């Protein structure tokens, strides 16, 4: 019943648009409604996740001032009971760091809408 | 048995076929002889004198590009002969004295044969302290091709191509001596459909593409092998893109398909995906307005609409889709929608055409090849215009005519420039009388000759009984019959099903064994058995309101025989799902729209008219997804696993199914119904789509459109006199739907027949007149 | 074999891997062959070194072990047959007349077009006593990338066998522990193999980006 | 840009139309960007430039 | 050459390649852009870097790019001496031993 | 920190300015040089220049006492976890100076082994071009970071500044969309 709240972190507004487009108000009709919180700066994302109340965080590994993998590592080291983290990786060879970030899932750029949706479903289920 | 002669190049012996040129033998042996005017596909000319080599027993150096091998010849190139090296370097020097100091600004820079061969076979510094020859630069010889005569090395490759390969000698070597220069006559532009090849054939930056001008250098281009998506020739190509935008598409090198040639369409008609009309996100209809929607929302809405449509759904696949995409459409329709209403014919067509394709085309791949057109003693063109449709077929036919003396016969209303360039003979037939001529040609000994060929165009479908007549003619004479469509994906669609009466691999729908075989291959209980509706039947049903929903993939309603009926059908259909690349008429009336990747962004494969597979990997890595994946995940949302997550999966499934291999369906055997009779002020309409026309994929390329042939209504002299018209004066051809006005051209056609460009700008015969070829249209002056 | 070792076949003039920017120049076929066996009178001390190697090794063993001898640019490269590498290495190190005490390392190189011999390991050996230099070249197929580890003879090959395994996947069997040294143990693939992509990212620019050099055109 | 080993230069040319000419000859550099987070100061660019259009000042 | 504008191609070279020499222009363009193409071969060349024999195994496939370049950096091999030079001594002695090896990790890892 | 609990006004403004002045001075770097840029940091400390003139002589060996992490080198894949660990083990406030092109964006090494910019793993406050940046460039970047620190807010001002910076950053188009004058 609660609208799942998803944090979308990316300096690039187009990556946020793509994430918010692959995912919709409902990932599937069986899932609850989805609410998106866009954040463009790592401090703001950290503050938001400090307030809690998030079911998933999508962090762009290509974020300019503070990459998504660093933010994922930070949040998993700083927020207790933090939501599962999905990281967007700018290249295949970033996969290793995606593992190091301990993000529950990694989706390479360019963001395949279906792959992102499937990963999000797997993390929420 | 081919005769092998043997000779020594430098000091290494080699055996090559008799008649081989020394330059070719050196190539096979790995010796790099500098060359400018030589071209493997052009008749040697020996102009530039760059390829000189020393041959024992000859006082003068011999141009290796003009010297035929001899059984005991001794050849020593610049690598093993000071005389040959000195000659080649002197020629290079003389070649560079007049050349402009333009390398930084020359488009050919970095990819210039002159630069590379001057480095490898030239002196390090100039001795030319004198004044260089100069010309105004760059002058335009056409809307697409710029000419910088100062850089020209007068290798004549452009002219030799425009004369030999393409029969379009609108450029030639003008003037004399140092003033000699390639040029058009006065203002008559270089009008060849293959003009772009002259840009790719020039060994210097003399001829350049105006579109590619100053766009990039070789180093920053991402270059990928590709297959042209425009027509059925399936030319190999090289797509070069910079910063994610395609800048040019070179001819590639496929000796079995197109050798090293393109038509201007394939070379330059790549901007369609970037004209600003592209659909970037899934769209949904709400409150009568089409607005962006998330992939999840769009998929859910589409699935709900299709499920509520039950089995009352039609699937218009169009001809643009790759083989994998067409297979996805067929599988989706016959598994998810449980309907046989799949039809790729987004054009004039008939049930006879479906029967003919099932009987004689589907599953029968590689029956005829380009290499055989090049050798066929006789080629009979029925409802097919090689230049306007599948230009590389025209190139191969011209090659055969020039080399092997192929005889070309065309059952067409008039001699198109393409047919004239093939030296073909017309059998003047008013459209609709093609069956009569085809039946009457049973006794033509020319077809009886071994290897004779019949090429049937898609347009021949519009003539009732014409395909049956062609099949009868092929059976009687034994000439191999080959069907050549316009669009690239049509043959792939046939092999992938996509017809109401065909399953994948040419498996007939009306066959319990084939149906069970495919069902087992798909891990499904059973396939629909009800006969499928064709495109015309689907549109008629939808217009009447008896169709619940439509799945339209890449279809231009204007291309349909009755576009008014098509728009009425899509509008009256309660639910319409569009898998579309660009905003279109269907999109303007669809309830759900799914953006699908263009060819340059998607993996896949086409099937040329030969049935040859033409695979290609994506050039632009992008989040855009093919029709195949959109259908797969739409089915997944609907709850059925299409098992087609990627083009590789579709290819593997098609390979697993294989061809039918059982009882081939019967021949169409349709009757030759009587043709309509045109009364006073009326004429039977003939038409075929011009290569450069108002085709959607040709959008975004104004230069290519400018290169398009001038639209003109073509009439017999008697017919023009009857309506009181004069050659060059405007003429109007009209039906209840509307009228088309074009300048008149007297063309020595059969009397009572009027020809129009089917979709040239200002013609749009289907859109305006609402009738296909063979219909009766009122004619008038002014 | 006796012909020069063809490592790649380039088709078309101007060193273009693709179809060709200009029509008609793509028909040249030139195999890229690394130098073959040198005629016997090797220059300098190479002749003496090979004479001594053939004296210490039996004629049969010498034939079985030394696949080729290449004197290129006044440098001696013994294309040694795999399996026999430890024996010839011991002979070179221990024999007083050869005495190549200093093995300088192991360098991996990949020849994806060299059928059956895709992977090559190069052992630069130096004899300080005699002030001599040679290289040993050992070829292994991509399908069976195993090579005898010289750890017993030249301990220095450790961290060189490991590095070349990391970057090419050459399995130096008998090595005390052939673990990755440069890449993380969790890494997938062997970076310096030619088939392994460069793994760069596009360079950003206002309104554009330049793909990595491996994706863009080249005329090698 | 061709000679830059770090791909630190992006350049696009355009025609010097008579109405708007920026450099002599028929081409000029319409878009010219240096990604100084990729530049390594090697100086191959200035060695490459055939017009001395690109120099390296002492400013750092 | 230097000038008021800064460091750049000397005006004499600019004049030669853009005004007088077509061959000079071609050579400049090609050698700058794709560079020389080295005959196919395989060479090992060693120098005495401050930390020992800096070796270079270099392979050319006849192209304009090096087919394979490998540096036997002396630091990489020298670091194998840390186990011998540190084991048995104190951590302070280990610091001195490692400093004596004087590794430069850039040459080590490459 | 009680300094954050202080209410706005002249008190908080003076605390902010005093903290900024104090922290710009004594900005102890972490002893964390990588690759060749580390040699340039050492040169910056060398006599010809003097990092000490800015109170930055004490290169805190332990991350605990370090205030500024001058990455100063190319970060390999295997090293990114170590660099992040060092950054975390420093204590607030923390600043990162991506010295050199490699640290800032991967520089010339656009390949698998390099991380393509420090910011992929830790927040970067100043990007410093150069390969390596000559010591004057390092001092320039350090002074720019000093200016940034001096204006650093605190408490409620910190929260408001974070919100405002968010509002501003949400709107900036990406660099890929700055197509000015591109053909
Ligand atoms: C408490 C309270 C409020 C009380 C009230 C009163 C009050 C306010 C104050 C009371 C007094 C108090 C408490 C005062 C506070 C201050 C205090 C207590 C002390 C702290 C200050 C202090 C101890 C100052 C002096 C210390 C000092 C002399 C420091 C200088 C140290 C030096 C010389 C450092 C330079 C070292 C250096 C060059 C570093 C570079 C090394 C780096 C980073 C590179 C890494 C690196 C290295 C190292 C290689 O070896 C290498 C070799 C080859 C290739 C690459 C590398 C490479 O990457
Ligand atoms: N679903 C899908 N649609 C496509 C694809 N490629 C192009 N289209 C669309 O299909 C529509 C119909 O194309 P056509 O009827 O062939 O128009 P055209 O290709 O420009 O002209 P002709 O091919 O000569 O008839 C166009 O509006 C395109 O936007 C594709 O790969 N998949
Ligand atoms: S055609 Fe070749 S040699 Fe002439 S200016 Fe252009 S690149 Fe230079
Ligand atoms: S324009 Fe090009 S192809 Fe034609 S003659 Fe001149 S150099 Fe040859
Ligand atoms: S002939 Fe057809 S396939 Fe070939 S380039 Fe032209 S449009 Fe493309
Ligand atoms: S100094 Fe010039 S050539 Fe060298 S990397 Fe920087 S921009 Fe490129
Ligand atoms: S920026 Fe240059 S000097 Fe600094 S670490 Fe990278 S390559 Fe070395
Ligand atoms: S290439 Fe033979 S003379 Fe021109």
Curated annotation (Swiss-Prot), chain C:
Membrane topology note: Peripheral membrane protein
Q: What EC number is given for this enzyme?
A: 7.1.1.-
- Supply one GO CC term from the record: plasma membrane
Say which family it is in: Belongs to the complex I 30 kDa subunit family.
Described by its record, this protein's role is as follows: NDH-1 shuttles electrons from NADH, via FMN and iron-sulfur (Fe-S) centers, to quinones in the respiratory chain. The immediate electron acceptor for the enzyme in this species is believed to be a menaquinone. Couples the redox reaction to proton translocation (for every two electrons transferred, four hydrogen ions are translocated across the cytoplasmic membrane), and thus conserves the redox energy in a proton gradient.
Q: Which InterPro entries match?
A: NADH_DH_suC, NADH_quin_OxRdtase_su_C/D-like, NADH_UbQ_OxRdtase_30kDa_su
Name of the protein in its database record: NADH-quinone oxidoreductase subunit C
Keyword annotations: Cell membrane, Membrane, NAD, Quinone, Translocase, Transport
Keyword hit for Phosphoprotein: no
**What is the source species?**
Mycolicibacterium smegmatis (strain ATCC 700084 / mc(2)155)
Among its keywords, does the record have Membrane? yes
The record's Pfam families line, in alphabetical order, gives: Complex1_30kDa
Swiss-Prot record, chain D:
Compartments (UniProt record): Cell membrane
Binding positions ([4Fe-4S] cluster 1): 49
Q: Name the residues that bind [4Fe-4S] cluster 2.
A: 4, 39, 42, 45
User: Which segments constitute the 4Fe-4S ferredoxin-type domain?
Assistant: 30-59
| Position of the signal peptide | none
Cystine pairings recorded for this chain: none
Q: How does it assemble?
A: NDH-1 is composed of 14 different subunits. Subunits NuoA, H, J, K, L, M, N constitute the membrane sector of the complex.
Q: What does this protein do?
A: NDH-1 shuttles electrons from NADH, via FMN and iron-sulfur (Fe-S) centers, to quinones in the respiratory chain. The immediate electron acceptor for the enzyme in this species is believed to be menaquinone. Couples the redox reaction to proton translocation (for every two electrons transferred, four hydrogen ions are translocated across the cytoplasmic membrane), and thus conserves the redox energy in a proton gradient.
Family, per entry? Belongs to the complex I 23 kDa subunit family.
Q: Identify this protein by name.
A: NADH-quinone oxidoreductase subunit I
To which species is this protein native? Mycolicibacterium smegmatis (strain ATCC 700084 / mc(2)155) (Mycobacterium smegmatis)
Task: Name the gene.
Answer: nuoI
UniProtKB/Swiss-Prot annotation, chain E:
Q: Where in the cell is it found?
A: Cell membrane
Q: What does this protein do?
A: NDH-1 shuttles electrons from NADH, via FMN and iron-sulfur (Fe-S) centers, to quinones in the respiratory chain. The immediate electron acceptor for the enzyme in this species is believed to be a menaquinone. Couples the redox reaction to proton translocation (for every two electrons transferred, four hydrogen ions are translocated across the cytoplasmic membrane), and thus conserves the redox energy in a proton gradient.
What does the annotation say about its assembly with partners?
A: NDH-1 is composed of 14 different subunits. Subunits NuoB, C, D, E, F, and G constitute the peripheral sector of the complex.
Question: What's this protein's family per the entry?
Answer: Belongs to the complex I 49 kDa subunit family.
The protein's name is NADH-quinone oxidoreductase subunit D
From Swiss-Prot, chain F:
- In which residues is [4Fe-4S] cluster bound? 36-37, 102, 131
Q: Which cysteines are joined by disulfide bonds?
A: none
Which UniProt keywords are listed?
A: 4Fe-4S, Cell membrane, Iron, Iron-sulfur, Membrane, Metal-binding, NAD, Quinone, Translocase, Transport
Record NCBIfam families: nuoB_fam, PRK06411.1
**Where found, per UniProt?**
Cell membrane
The record lists the catalysed reaction(s) as: a quinone + NADH + 5 H(+)(in) = a quinol + NAD(+) + 4 H(+)(out)
InterPro entries from the xrefs? NADH_UbQ_OxRdtase-like_20kDa, NADH_UQ_OxRdtase_20Kd_su
Q: What is its EC number?
A: 7.1.1.-
What this protein needs as a cofactor is: [4Fe-4S] cluster
Q: Name one Pfam family in it.
A: Oxidored_q6
Q: Could you tell me the membrane topology recorded for this protein? A: Peripheral membrane protein
Q: Which gene encodes it?
A: nuoB
GO MF term list: 4 iron, 4 sulfur cluster binding; iron ion binding; NADH dehydrogenase (ubiquinone) activity; NADH:ubiquinone reductase (non-electrogenic) activity; quinone binding
Tell me, how does this one assemble? NDH-1 is composed of 14 different subunits. Subunits NuoB, C, D, E, F, and G constitute the peripheral sector of the complex.
Key word Transport present: yes
* Protein name per its UniProtKB record: NADH-quinone oxidoreductase subunit B
Taxonomic lineage: Bacteria, Bacillati, Actinomycetota, Actinomycetes, Mycobacteriales
Instruction: List the PROSITE patterns hit by this protein, alphabetically.
Output: COMPLEX1_20K
GO CC annotation: plasma membrane; respiratory chain complex I
Which Gene Ontology terms describe the biological processes this protein takes part in? Answer: aerobic respiration; electron transport coupled proton transport
What family is this? Belongs to the complex I 20 kDa subunit family.
Q: Taking the first listed entry, what is the main subcellular location of this protein, grouped into a coarse class?
A: membrane
Organism per entry:
Mycolicibacterium smegmatis (strain ATCC 700084 / mc(2)155)
Q: How is the cofactor bound?
A: Binds 1 [4Fe-4S] cluster.
Q: Which domain of life is it from?
A: Bacteria
């Amino acid at each position: 019943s609660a609208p799942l709240r998803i944090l979308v972190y990316s300096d690039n507004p187009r990556t946020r648009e793509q994430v918010r487009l692959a995912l919709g108000k409902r990932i599937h009709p069986e899932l609850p409604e989805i609410e998106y919180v866009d954040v463009a700066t790592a401090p703001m994302a950290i503050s938001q996740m400090d307030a809690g109340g998030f079911d998933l965080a999508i962090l762009d590994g290509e974020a300019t001032p503070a990459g998504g993998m660093g933010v994922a590592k930070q949040v998993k080291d700083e927020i207790d009971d933090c939501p599962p983290i999905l990281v967007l990786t700018g290249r295949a060879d970033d996969a290793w760091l995606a593992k190091w970030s301990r993000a529950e899932a990694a989706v390479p750029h360019p963001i395949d809408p279906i792959r992102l949706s499937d990963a999000v479903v797997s993390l929420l289920r | 048995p081919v005769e092998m002669v043997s000779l020594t190049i430098d000091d290494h012996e080699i055996s090559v076929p008799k008649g081989t040129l020394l330059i070719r033998a050196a190539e096979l042996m790995g010796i790099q002889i500098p060359r400018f005017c030589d071209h493997p596909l052009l008749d040697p000319v020996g102009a530039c004198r760059q390829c000189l080599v020393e041959v024992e027993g000859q006082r003068k150096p011999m141009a290796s590009c003009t010297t035929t091998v001899m059984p005991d010849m001794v050849v020593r190139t610049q690598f093993t002969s000071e005389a040959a090296d000195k000659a080649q370097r002197g020629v290079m020097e003389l070649l560079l004295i007049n050349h402009p100091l333009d390398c930084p600004i020359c488009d050919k820079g970095g990819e210039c044969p002159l630069q590379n061969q001057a480095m490898s076979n030239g002196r390090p510094e100039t001795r030319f302290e004198d004044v260089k020859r100069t010309f105004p630069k760059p002058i335009s010889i056409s809307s697409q091709v710029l000419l910088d005569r100062e850089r020209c090395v007068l290798c004549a490759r452009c002219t030799r191509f425009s004369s030999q390969i393409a029969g379009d000698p609108f450029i030639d070597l003008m003037e004399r001596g140092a003033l000699q220069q390639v040029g058009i006559g006065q203002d008559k532009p270089f009008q060849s459909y293959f003009s772009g090849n002259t840009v790719q054939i020039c060994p210097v930056g003399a001829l350049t593409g105006t579109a590619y001008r100053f766009r990039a250098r070789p180093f920053d281009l991402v270059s990928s092998p590709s297959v042209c998506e425009h027509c059925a020739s399936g030319c190999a190509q090289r797509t070069d893109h910079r910063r994610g935008k395609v800048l040019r598409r070179l001819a590639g090198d496929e000796p079995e398909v197109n050798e090293e040639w393109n038509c201007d369409k394939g070379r330059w008609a790549f901007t369609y995906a970037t004209v600003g009309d592209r659909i970037t996100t899934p769209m949904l209809r709400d409150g009568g307005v089409l607005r962006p929607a998330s992939w999840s929302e769009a998929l859910t809405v589409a699935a709900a609409g299709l499920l509520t449509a039950a089995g009352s759904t039609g699937v218009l696949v169009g001809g643009r889709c790759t083989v994998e995409d067409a297979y996805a459409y067929a599988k989706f329709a016959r598994m998810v929608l449980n309907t046989n209403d799949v039809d790729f014919r987004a054009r004039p067509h008939s049930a006879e055409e479906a029967e003919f394709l099932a009987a004689h085309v589907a599953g029968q791949t590689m029956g005829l090849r380009y290499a055989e057109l090049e050798n066929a003693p006789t080629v009979l063109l029925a409802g097919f215009e090689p230049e306007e449709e599948s230009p590389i077929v025209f190139l191969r036919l011209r090659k055969g005519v020039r080399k092997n003396g192929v005889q070309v016969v065309a059952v067409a209303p008039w001699a198109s420039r393409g047919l004239t360039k093939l030296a073909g003979t017309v059998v003047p037939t008013v459209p609709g009388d093609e069956p009569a001529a085809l039946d009457g040609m049973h006794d033509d000994d020319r077809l009886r000759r071994p290897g004779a060929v019949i090429l049937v165009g898609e347009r021949l479908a519009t003539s009732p009984g014409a395909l049956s007549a062609a099949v009868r003619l092929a059976a009687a004479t034994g000439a191999r019959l080959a069907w050549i469509p316009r669009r690239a994906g049509e043959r792939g669609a046939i092999e992938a099903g996509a017809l109401p009466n065909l399953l994948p691999g040419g498996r007939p729908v009306d066959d319990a064994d084939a149906r069970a075989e495919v069902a087992r291959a798909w891990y499904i209980s059973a396939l629909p058995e009800a006969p499928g509706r064709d495109t015309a039947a689907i549109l008629s049903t939808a217009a009447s309101g008896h169709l619940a929903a439509l799945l339209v993939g890449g279809v231009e309603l204007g291309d349909l025989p009755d576009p008014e009926l098509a728009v009425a059908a899509v509008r009256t259909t309660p639910f319409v799902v569009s898998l579309e690349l660009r905003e279109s008429a269907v999109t303007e009336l669809a309830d759900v729209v799914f953006p699908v990747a263009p060819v340059v962004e998607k993996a896949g494969s086409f099937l040329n008219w030969e049935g040859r597979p033409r695979p290609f990997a994506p050039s632009l890595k992008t989040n855009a997804i093919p029709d195949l994946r959109v259908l797969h995940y739409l089915a997944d949302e609907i709850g059925v696993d299409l098992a087609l997550p990627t083009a590789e999966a579709a290819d593997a499934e098609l390979a697993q199914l294989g061809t039918w291999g059982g009882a081939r369906p019967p021949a169409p055997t349709a009757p030759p119904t009587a043709r309509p009779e045109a009364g006073s002020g009326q004429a039977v309409l003939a038409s075929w789509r011009m290569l450069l026309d108002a085709g959607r994929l040709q959008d975004g390329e104004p230069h290519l459109a400018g290169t398009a042939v001038r639209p003109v209504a073509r009439m017999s002299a008697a017919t023009a006199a009857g309506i009181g018209a004069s050659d060059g004066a405007p003429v109007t051809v009209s039906t209840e739907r509307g009228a088309v006005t074009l300048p008149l051209a007297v063309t020595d056609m059969p009397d009572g027949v009027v020809w129009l460009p089917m979709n040239s700008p200002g013609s749009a015969v289907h859109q305006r007149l609402g009738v296909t070829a063979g219909a009766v249209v009122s004619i008038g002056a002014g | 074999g006796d012909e020069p070792e063809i490592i790649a076949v380039r088709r078309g003039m101007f060193g273009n891997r693709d179809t060709g920017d200009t029509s008609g120049y793509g028909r040249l076929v030139r195999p890229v062959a690394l130098p073959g066996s040198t005629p016997r009178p090797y220059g300098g001390y190479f002749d003496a070194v090979m004479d001594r190697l053939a004296e210490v090794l039996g004629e049969e063993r010498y034939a079985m072990s030394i696949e080729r001898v290449v004197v290129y640019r006044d440098q001696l490269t013994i294309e040694v047959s795999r399996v026999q590498l430890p024996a010839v290495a011991s002979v070179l190190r221990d024999d007083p007349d050869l005495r190549f005490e200093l093995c300088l390392g192991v360098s991996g190189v990949h020849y994806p077009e060299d059928t059956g011999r895709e992977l090559h390991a190069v052992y630069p050996l130096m004899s300080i006593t005699h002030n001599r230099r040679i290289q040993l070249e050992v070829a292994a197929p991509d399908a069976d990338p195993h090579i005898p580890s010289l750890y017993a003879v030249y301990p220095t090959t450790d961290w060189h066998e490991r590095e070349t395994y990391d970057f090419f996947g050459i399995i130096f069997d008998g090595h005390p522990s052939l673990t990755r040294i440069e890449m993380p143990d969790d890494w997938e693939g062997h970076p310096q193999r030619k088939d392994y992509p460069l793994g760069g990212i596009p360079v950003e620019y206002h309104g554009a980006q330049i793909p990595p050099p491996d994706q863009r055109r080249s005329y090698s | 840009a061709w000679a830059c080993p770090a791909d630190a230069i992006y350049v696009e040319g355009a025609d010097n139309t008579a109405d708007e000419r920026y450099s002599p000859g028929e081409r000029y550099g319409r878009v010219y960007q240096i990604n100084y987070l990729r530049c390594i100061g090697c100086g191959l660019c200035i060695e490459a430039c055939p017009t001395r259009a690109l120099t390296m000042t002492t400013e750092y | 050459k230097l000038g008021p504008d800064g460091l750049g191609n000397s005006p004499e070279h600019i004049a030669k390649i853009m005004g007088r020499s077509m061959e000079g222009l071609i050579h400049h363009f090609k050698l700058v852009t794709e560079g020389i193409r080295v005959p196919p071969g395989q060479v090992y060349v060693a120098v005495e870097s401050p930390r020992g024999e800096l070796g270079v195994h270099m392979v050319s496939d006849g192209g304009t790019r090096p087919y394979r370049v490998h540096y036997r950096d002396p630091s990489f091999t020298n670091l194998q001496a840390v186990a011998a030079t540190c084991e048995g001594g104190m951590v302070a002695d280990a610091i001195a031993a490692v400093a004596s090896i004087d590794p430069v990790m850039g040459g080590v890892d490459r | 920190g009680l300094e954050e609990r202080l209410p706005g006004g002249i008190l908080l403004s003076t605390v902010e300015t005093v903290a900024g002045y104090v922290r710009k001075g004594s900005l102890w770097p972490a002893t964390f040089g990588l690759a060749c840029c580390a040699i340039e940091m050492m040169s910056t400390a060398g006599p010809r220049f003097d990092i000490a003139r800015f109170g930055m002589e004490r290169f805190s060996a332990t991350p605990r006492q370090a205030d500024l992490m001058i990455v100063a080198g190319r970060v390999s894949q295997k090293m990114a976890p170590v660099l992040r660990q060092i950054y975390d083990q420093m204590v607030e406030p923390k600043w990162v100076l991506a010295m050199g092109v490699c640290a800032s964006s991967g520089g010339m090494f656009n390949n698998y082994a390099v991380v393509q910019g420090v910011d992929h793993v830790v927040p970067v406050d100043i990007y410093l071009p150069g390969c390596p940046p000559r010591p004057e460039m390092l001092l320039h970047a350090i002074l720019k970071l000093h200016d940034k620190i001096q204006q650093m807010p605190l408490g409620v001002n910190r929260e408001e500044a974070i919100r405002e910076a968010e509002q501003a950053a949400l709107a900036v188009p990406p660099t890929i969309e700055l197509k000015g004058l591109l053909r």
